[PDB]
Design an enzyme around this catalytic site. Structure first.
Site, PDB file in Angstrom:
ATOM      1  NE  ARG A 129      18.828   1.312 -24.401  1.00  0.00           N
ATOM      2  CZ  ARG A 129      19.050   1.727 -25.520  1.00  0.00           C
ATOM      3  NH1 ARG A 129      19.763   2.431 -25.895  1.00  0.00           N
ATOM      4  NH2 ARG A 129      18.188   2.646 -26.468  1.00  0.00           N
ATOM      5  CG  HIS A 150      12.724  -1.310 -25.941  1.00  0.00           C
ATOM      6  ND1 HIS A 150      13.242  -1.509 -24.710  1.00  0.00           N
ATOM      7  CD2 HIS A 150      12.710  -0.846 -26.715  1.00  0.00           C
ATOM      8  CE1 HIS A 150      13.173  -0.135 -25.027  1.00  0.00           C
ATOM      9  NE2 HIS A 150      12.765   0.212 -26.178  1.00  0.00           N
ATOM     10  CB  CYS A 154       9.846   3.616 -29.151  1.00  0.00           C
ATOM     11  SG  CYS A 154      10.628   3.268 -30.731  1.00  0.00           S
ATOM     12  NE  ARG A 169       9.908   2.780 -22.013  1.00  0.00           N
ATOM     13  CZ  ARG A 169      11.270   2.745 -22.179  1.00  0.00           C
ATOM     14  NH1 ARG A 169      11.923   3.875 -23.075  1.00  0.00           N
ATOM     15  NH2 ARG A 169      12.307   1.805 -21.807  1.00  0.00           N
TER      16      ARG A 169
END
Lengths: 346, 346, 346
Positions: B120, B147, B287, B332
């Site tokens: 990340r 992403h 998100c 997620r």
């Protein structure tokens, strides 16, 4: 293609090593060291074959890093995990041990909670105190004066890249700034195992004078040999392995770099230096990270200022067929696993 | 009350996906994406039923975060743990990869120690290099331009909140600043799956022109549709889901905020905007984190300066019955689990 | 040599405690508290005997530390690991919860991912909100006004160091600055369990006036006793245990130290103070870390400036046979394990 193939003495060491700390190579015999190196080889073969037996199942290990080091951290974590241990990573905080609370107190608390502790930090005096008061095995991930785990990794790698030679039969040179933990442990290691080591670099950066005298007393007994020289041609001649490490310092100082680079440059390991060994099977080693090229930010910066692409080693050597730095890097884990299983293994 | 209920093709994907990296949605086919989304649904049902089978038992995973993100971190950790993997969290350090050591070197070392790696951070160029040299599956937790994990979570959630509609039958709009990783992946995702996406916001913040051309070439093939418009009324009309994300930037700049807020304000998702869809079953997505109210410090501050309670979305919408942001947030994990099991699952 | 040896009521508590948060001792009955203390004793005996049964197998726990604390962190990690749980350590970040995202939102996301959450941070209002919205057991690792886990550890230790006395029969004094989480919880704890507590120190630093009134209402019911006094001789008389904690503050202020030291010095626990109890079996306790000597950097500094070797306690007392600070320190883990198993144990 490249590995180390090796009674009552197998478990005589198991006894000696159980519950011991692993603070410095000076604290171990040549047989004890060989054992850890041999154990590492088994653990490595076991993991690869998918037949590894967990000897640390249920154990909890504390990993103290007063000064961050992903590479040694991972080595311990993966080693612990493979063996069934759980890990608590305690990284750099606002205060360092001693600023407001002593090791004596810290050691005693961690010892009650954990089964083993790893320390990576400052002076050896600190780990030694942790080792004295923790009551559980303590392992030196790196101190100012020593870095034992690294050397186990280095010797295993040497054995793996030799065609049936014992450490006692190897010859190797370390070029650069040897006055540090890596230089020190490589010398003690070389001495303990009866090897032929040569520290090639400026006299001012040879290891501690007392340490050298101590290591030479050892060498004399093990049939090893230590030579300190500023002469590269004479130093790298006939070696099986060449070894170096970054000799600049991120931070101090703008012109100290002009100065430092000027002093150390003659000792960079370049193809020309490997050719001086007169040994085409020569292998290059580096504890990493290495400033071997023009691609990192500090690399382009060094290129523009000193017109050099790589400092202690050239990209050509680093990515050459002689380079075994990544086998060496992987071996940090197998050897660290050996240290833990031998001392805390049940 | 809200879930996704779905031969030789089940394991034909298992093959295609084994050992693959997961760097961007552009690297996958519509069937491959659907598979990951379907797998996620199973893993989710399994965990809930207490009948989850561990397919990552014994695996060690490295989690590289050059830029912290608790929410994506936890998603990976819990996913790994549920599957029998162990995790090493490598967070933001003093130096970033490239400053003094290259990905090429870093990738090669982690690859020897770990079985899978998550990155990340910054540019896609970086993960792509890690993906090329690690030798183990690499997964993009977020880069400047993409992403992917987030979008899997988003589409699973859409499927769960539809009464038997395929992604190919859904219509949705993203309001705000689409020129970023979330906007990009939502568009590629929408294109790959043959959806009807509409990016509603200032032309200056529509996604990259080349990317849009690329995604429209894809859409044409999958029977999807992409429309970019500054007109909210026309953009949100008849959508099943409305989606947004914070469009301000913590830091730069005092008046850049006066400016930014003025430009983006017309695109906040408020009840009035949901009513413009002409669809009472419309669902809101975000998100997260969202600046949806007057309670955070930066929220009271925005209230006093611009007289607004919430920026990109109003508290009323965020806590409304249309909001599914927390199902979306939970997803997620199930989707990230899917990515790992599919690529590294044994 | 020093341990705590203790029907339908065993599992009547199991019921009451299942799914409960552990935010403050005020939220529990005397029987409930005793149960947690008794459970801790079993878990401790089980671990020592190598017969511990994992009641958290498969559970994932989030450890939120907005303000670092290795000692409480380790207590949770080792407790979780011993029980088969996995842990995600979320340490201090750039922003604190509330700055840009609310607990309400944070709690709701973690709750979907994790099975239990630990919070160590600022105001109680914060944990209370986390407790209200997480939907999973939340445990207070420390807030400004309370520190419950510590007190469980403290009472277990008291029971272990008594020859068959119940908490209801113990007498103890806390010397120093009682106007804080430790002072508060010790008083609530003492009240709930019907003990005889005495807060010895400057009136200005006695605990909150409302809290004292609340705790005295409780004491009256449990047959306990709370006395607040500035008189050491009268306060420590006949106590079984003496307890203190650092009363200076790293940071503010140069002369605030001259001032602070002058005010608190009369309350340091020194041999002379133990002798005033008229009880040779008196034991000393300290939540740690303690500034008990001349060896830390801040210790030499205090020595040079105020001519003192140790502030709240002297080295002689700290390393004396009366000191049980390390048993006390170990007990943080066994008691924290009790809290988790009781609330989340399956």
């Amino acid at each position: 293609h490249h590995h180390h193939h090796h009674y009552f003495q197998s478990n005589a060491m198991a006894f000696n090593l159980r519950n011991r700390n692993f603070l410095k190579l000076l604290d171990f015999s040549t047989k004890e060291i060989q054992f850890l190196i041999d154990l590492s080889a088994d653990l490595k073969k076991a993991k690869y074959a998918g037949t590894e037996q967990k000897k640390l199942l249920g154990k909890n290990i504390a990993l103290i890093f007063e000064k961050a080091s992903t590479r040694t951290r991972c080595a311990f974590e993966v080693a612990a995990f493979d063996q069934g241990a759980q890990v608590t990573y305690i990284g750099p905080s606002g205060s360092q041990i001693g600023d407001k609370e002593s090791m004596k107190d810290t050691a005693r608390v961690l010892g009650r909670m954990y089964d083993g502790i790893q320390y990576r930090g400052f002076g050896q005096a600190i780990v030694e105190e942790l080792g004295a008061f923790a009551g559980v095995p303590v392992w030196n991930g790196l101190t100012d004066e020593f870095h034992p785990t690294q050397i186990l990794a280095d010797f295993l790698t040497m054995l793996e890249h030799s065609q049936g030679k014992a450490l006692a039969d190897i010859q190797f040179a370390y070029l650069g700034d040897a006055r540090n933990n890596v230089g020190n442990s490589l010398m003690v290691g070389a001495a303990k195992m009866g090897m032929d080591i040569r520290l090639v670099g400026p006299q001012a950066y040879w290891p501690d004078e007392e340490l050298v005298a101590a290591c030479q007393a050892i060498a004399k007994q093990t049939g090893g040999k230590i030579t300190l020289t500023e002469n590269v041609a004479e130093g790298v001649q006939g070696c099986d392995f060449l070894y170096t490490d970054v000799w600049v310092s991120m931070g101090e100082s703008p012109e100290a770099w002009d100065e430092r680079v000027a002093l150390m440059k003659p000792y960079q390991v370049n193809m020309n230096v490997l050719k001086q060994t007169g040994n085409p099977n020569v292998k290059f080693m580096h504890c990493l990270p290495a400033f071997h090229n023009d691609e990192t930010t500090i690399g382009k910066q060094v290129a523009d200022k000193f017109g050099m692409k790589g400092l202690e080693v050239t990209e050509e050597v680093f990515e050459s067929e002689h380079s075994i730095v990544f086998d060496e890097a992987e071996n940090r884990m197998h050897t660290i696993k050996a240290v833990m299983v031998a001392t805390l293994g049940s």
